[PDB]
Amino acid sequence: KFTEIFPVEDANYPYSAFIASVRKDVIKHCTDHKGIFQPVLPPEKKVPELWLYTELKTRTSSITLAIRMDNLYLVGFRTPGGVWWEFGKDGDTHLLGDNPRWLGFGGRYQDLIGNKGLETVTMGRAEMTRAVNDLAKKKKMATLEEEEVPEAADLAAAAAADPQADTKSKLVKLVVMVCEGLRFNTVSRTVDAGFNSQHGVTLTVTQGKQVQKWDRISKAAFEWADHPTAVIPDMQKLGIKDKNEAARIVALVKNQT
């Protein structure tokens, strides 16, 4: 519904700038709840009602990300050839229009990276450049070549069971840098700090666990609006005690209403 553009490879355009710019356009569609420091996103619906489109470009290629405004999560992406790829599998219901194709897997961190924590997702500008260039070529196929050389049965079977391992990998790097970067200022701070480092940057185990509990800390955000002194198990479980620390972690909360 509204576009953002990020020139990945442009070293002079800081990641923090893109975040600050995109959050400002998103907050335009948010509400101010008393007792809740962070802006409250639009209420969730079965059919995403406002869409954030972020176009990530390199010097070579580019892709557009289709993000729901209500929960700030990726639904699919568009290639340069105009093919939309959506999270899901045959049998599901497409949220994207324009002849979208099913990726075959879902957007859960665990459709994506199994049971390995978010701390295993290496991020950075170079990491984002390769992900876009890679996904800009998302192919429909692997007919490819066990005729090249079973008796690599080991290779042959890995390819057969996890064909889009590469895609899942590139996708979960953008999900954390963009979606999660927008939701959590703890992630945007960490991703921006090491965005141009030569060996990439990652989020700590603890950060990953909080990131995965966005809904929960969003609920607490609302609970602390009513009772700001309340202690929250699910929160202290995560290394968060009070709305004050929570304000150093989440930037935008999920609307409970």
Swiss-Prot record:
Tissue: Accumulates to high levels in seeds.
Entry keyword Cytoplasm: yes
Superkingdom of source: Eukaryota
GO MF: rRNA N-glycosylase activity; toxin activity
Keywords: Cytoplasm, Hydrolase, Plant defense, Protein synthesis inhibitor, Toxin
The keyword Hydrolase appears for this protein: yes
Catalytic activity, as annotated: Endohydrolysis of the N-glycosidic bond at one specific adenosine on the 28S rRNA
Residue numbers annotated as active site: E180
PANTHER family in the record: ALBUMIN B-32, PTHR33453
Sequence similarity: Belongs to the ribosome-inactivating protein family. Type 1 RIP subfamily.
Name of protein: Ribosome-inactivating protein 3
